PDB file of C-alpha atoms in Angstrom:
ATOM      1  CA  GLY A 238       7.417  -6.581 -18.044  1.00 36.05           C
ATOM      2  CA  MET A 239       6.310  -8.479 -14.899  1.00 35.25           C
ATOM      3  CA  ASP A 240       9.198  -6.605 -13.153  1.00 34.45           C
ATOM      4  CA  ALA A 241       7.174  -3.333 -13.529  1.00 33.00           C
ATOM      5  CA  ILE A 242       4.174  -5.076 -11.835  1.00 33.36           C
ATOM      6  CA  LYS A 243       6.514  -6.276  -8.992  1.00 32.44           C
ATOM      7  CA  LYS A 244       8.057  -2.747  -8.660  1.00 31.69           C
ATOM      8  CA  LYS A 245       4.665  -0.884  -8.598  1.00 31.59           C
ATOM      9  CA  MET A 246       3.196  -3.399  -6.065  1.00 29.68           C
ATOM     10  CA  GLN A 247       6.316  -3.076  -3.808  1.00 31.94           C
ATOM     11  CA  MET A 248       6.220   0.766  -4.262  1.00 31.84           C
ATOM     12  CA  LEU A 249       2.496   0.913  -3.227  1.00 31.72           C
ATOM     13  CA  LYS A 250       3.382  -1.260  -0.148  1.00 34.29           C
ATOM     14  CA  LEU A 251       6.178   1.274   0.709  1.00 33.58           C
ATOM     15  CA  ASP A 252       3.761   4.277   0.313  1.00 33.40           C
ATOM     16  CA  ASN A 253       1.275   2.375   2.556  1.00 33.92           C
ATOM     17  CA  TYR A 254       4.150   1.819   5.085  1.00 33.03           C
ATOM     18  CA  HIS A 255       5.064   5.583   5.063  1.00 31.54           C
ATOM     19  CA  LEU A 256       1.357   6.478   5.628  1.00 33.38           C
ATOM     20  CA  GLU A 257       1.055   3.887   8.486  1.00 31.58           C
ATOM     21  CA  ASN A 258       4.238   5.486  10.014  1.00 32.84           C
ATOM     22  CA  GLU A 259       2.597   8.977   9.694  1.00 35.41           C
ATOM     23  CA  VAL A 260      -0.678   7.703  11.317  1.00 35.29           C
ATOM     24  CA  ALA A 261       1.489   6.093  14.073  1.00 34.07           C
ATOM     25  CA  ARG A 262       3.267   9.491  14.646  1.00 35.05           C
ATOM     26  CA  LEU A 263      -0.034  11.422  14.802  1.00 37.23           C
ATOM     27  CA  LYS A 264      -1.740   8.826  17.102  1.00 40.62           C
ATOM     28  CA  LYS A 265       1.254   9.076  19.513  1.00 40.97           C
ATOM     29  CA  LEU A 266       1.135  12.936  19.452  1.00 42.21           C
ATOM     30  CA  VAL A 267      -2.588  12.649  20.585  1.00 43.59           C
ATOM     31  CA  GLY A 268      -1.221  11.090  23.878  1.00 42.32           C
ATOM     32  CA  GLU A 269      -1.648   7.354  23.007  1.00 42.90           C
ATOM     33  CA  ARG A 270       0.783   4.503  24.045  1.00 43.07           C
TER      34      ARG A 270
ATOM     35  CA  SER B  77      13.095  -6.009  20.283  1.00 42.84           C
ATOM     36  CA  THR B  78       9.324  -6.195  19.578  1.00 45.64           C
ATOM     37  CA  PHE B  79       9.637  -3.457  16.883  1.00 45.04           C
ATOM     38  CA  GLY B  80      11.209  -6.012  14.422  1.00 41.66           C
ATOM     39  CA  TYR B  81       7.658  -7.471  13.931  1.00 41.47           C
ATOM     40  CA  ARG B  82       6.850  -4.317  11.784  1.00 39.38           C
ATOM     41  CA  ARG B  83      10.020  -2.135  11.234  1.00 37.87           C
ATOM     42  CA  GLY B  84      10.748  -2.820   7.524  1.00 34.72           C
ATOM     43  CA  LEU B  85       7.348  -4.595   6.826  1.00 34.63           C
ATOM     44  CA  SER B  86       4.064  -3.153   5.346  1.00 33.90           C
ATOM     45  CA  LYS B  87       0.407  -3.965   6.299  1.00 37.93           C
ATOM     46  CA  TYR B  88       0.470  -6.602   3.444  1.00 35.35           C
ATOM     47  CA  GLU B  89       3.480  -8.990   3.935  1.00 35.51           C
ATOM     48  CA  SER B  90       1.320 -12.147   3.301  1.00 32.75           C
ATOM     49  CA  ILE B  91       2.574 -13.195  -0.218  1.00 32.11           C
ATOM     50  CA  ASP B  92       5.816 -12.567  -2.202  1.00 31.27           C
ATOM     51  CA  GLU B  93       5.386 -10.619  -5.517  1.00 30.96           C
ATOM     52  CA  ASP B  94       7.362 -13.395  -7.319  1.00 27.83           C
ATOM     53  CA  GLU B  95       4.785 -16.061  -6.258  1.00 30.56           C
ATOM     54  CA  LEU B  96       1.718 -13.740  -6.628  1.00 32.71           C
ATOM     55  CA  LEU B  97       2.338 -13.459 -10.435  1.00 33.08           C
ATOM     56  CA  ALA B  98       3.682 -17.015 -10.948  1.00 32.53           C
ATOM     57  CA  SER B  99       0.646 -18.790 -12.575  1.00 32.78           C
ATOM     58  CA  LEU B 100      -0.470 -16.100 -15.123  1.00 28.47           C
ATOM     59  CA  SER B 101      -0.586 -16.552 -18.936  1.00 29.60           C
ATOM     60  CA  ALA B 102       1.507 -14.402 -21.358  1.00 28.35           C
ATOM     61  CA  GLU B 103      -1.594 -12.348 -22.460  1.00 28.41           C
ATOM     62  CA  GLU B 104      -2.682 -11.915 -18.776  1.00 28.44           C
ATOM     63  CA  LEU B 105       0.791 -10.528 -17.842  1.00 27.77           C
ATOM     64  CA  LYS B 106       0.454  -8.023 -20.775  1.00 26.45           C
ATOM     65  CA  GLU B 107      -3.062  -6.906 -19.684  1.00 25.89           C
ATOM     66  CA  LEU B 108      -1.936  -6.719 -15.987  1.00 25.67           C
ATOM     67  CA  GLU B 109       1.085  -4.499 -16.911  1.00 24.77           C
ATOM     68  CA  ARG B 110      -1.412  -2.271 -18.864  1.00 27.35           C
ATOM     69  CA  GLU B 111      -3.366  -1.827 -15.559  1.00 27.43           C
ATOM     70  CA  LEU B 112      -0.333   0.089 -14.125  1.00 24.83           C
ATOM     71  CA  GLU B 113      -1.381   3.072 -16.328  1.00 27.59           C
ATOM     72  CA  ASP B 114      -4.887   3.080 -14.705  1.00 30.10           C
ATOM     73  CA  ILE B 115      -3.388   2.590 -11.167  1.00 29.55           C
ATOM     74  CA  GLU B 116      -1.186   5.787 -11.499  1.00 28.48           C
TER      75      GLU B 116
ATOM     76  CA  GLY C 206      -7.200 -14.849 -13.235  1.00 27.74           C
ATOM     77  CA  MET C 207      -5.161 -11.585 -13.346  1.00 28.82           C
ATOM     78  CA  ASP C 208      -8.365  -9.451 -12.905  1.00 30.22           C
ATOM     79  CA  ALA C 209      -8.362 -10.328  -9.170  1.00 30.46           C
ATOM     80  CA  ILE C 210      -4.741  -8.925  -9.029  1.00 28.06           C
ATOM     81  CA  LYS C 211      -5.809  -5.743 -10.965  1.00 27.86           C
ATOM     82  CA  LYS C 212      -8.461  -5.086  -8.265  1.00 27.12           C
ATOM     83  CA  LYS C 213      -5.897  -5.932  -5.485  1.00 28.55           C
ATOM     84  CA  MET C 214      -3.540  -3.183  -6.813  1.00 25.83           C
ATOM     85  CA  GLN C 215      -6.380  -0.607  -7.363  1.00 26.86           C
ATOM     86  CA  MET C 216      -7.411  -1.252  -3.682  1.00 26.99           C
ATOM     87  CA  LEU C 217      -3.993  -0.007  -2.362  1.00 25.66           C
ATOM     88  CA  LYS C 218      -4.652   3.479  -3.918  1.00 26.38           C
ATOM     89  CA  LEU C 219      -7.950   3.516  -1.882  1.00 26.77           C
ATOM     90  CA  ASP C 220      -6.330   2.315   1.429  1.00 27.35           C
ATOM     91  CA  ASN C 221      -3.701   5.082   0.930  1.00 26.35           C
ATOM     92  CA  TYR C 222      -6.661   7.542   0.379  1.00 29.19           C
ATOM     93  CA  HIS C 223      -8.349   6.394   3.669  1.00 30.76           C
ATOM     94  CA  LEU C 224      -4.931   6.812   5.396  1.00 25.67           C
ATOM     95  CA  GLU C 225      -4.296  10.338   3.904  1.00 26.06           C
ATOM     96  CA  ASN C 226      -7.815  11.381   5.058  1.00 28.84           C
ATOM     97  CA  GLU C 227      -7.069  10.078   8.609  1.00 29.36           C
ATOM     98  CA  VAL C 228      -3.614  11.825   8.540  1.00 25.51           C
ATOM     99  CA  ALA C 229      -5.452  15.075   7.622  1.00 24.57           C
ATOM    100  CA  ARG C 230      -8.122  14.491  10.385  1.00 24.49           C
ATOM    101  CA  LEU C 231      -5.453  13.786  13.074  1.00 23.15           C
ATOM    102  CA  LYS C 232      -3.239  16.766  11.931  1.00 24.11           C
ATOM    103  CA  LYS C 233      -6.428  18.886  12.516  1.00 18.85           C
ATOM    104  CA  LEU C 234      -7.058  17.374  16.011  1.00 20.34           C
ATOM    105  CA  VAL C 235      -3.390  17.863  17.150  1.00 22.40           C
ATOM    106  CA  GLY C 236      -3.114  21.407  15.612  1.00 23.94           C
ATOM    107  CA  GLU C 237      -0.326  20.603  13.041  1.00 22.66           C
ATOM    108  CA  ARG C 238      -2.734  21.460  10.099  1.00 26.10           C
TER     109      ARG C 238
END
C-alpha cells in the first residue's frame, strides 16, 4: 500500500545518508576540515 | 553540538512522507506503488 | 499528480549513482581502492 511507498522513500533517504557519510569520510581522509 | 543539524537527517528532510502522498487519488496510489518495481 | 513523485523517487537512484562514482573516485585518490 502507501506504506510501501513511504518505506522505499525513507529507505532511499537512508542509503543517500550512508553514501553522504562515506563521501564525508573520504573527503576528511584527503586532509579537509 | 553543531552535528545535530545533520546527524540522523538525510540531504532531503524538506517534506514528511505522510504529507507528500496526502492528496493522491486511489488509482494514483496504485500506479505509484507499481513504480517501486521500476525503482528497484 | 503522482508522476512528479515517480520521477522524484527515480532521481534518488541517480543521486546515489553520482555519490557511488565520487566514493570510487575519492577511494582511488586516497589509495583505499
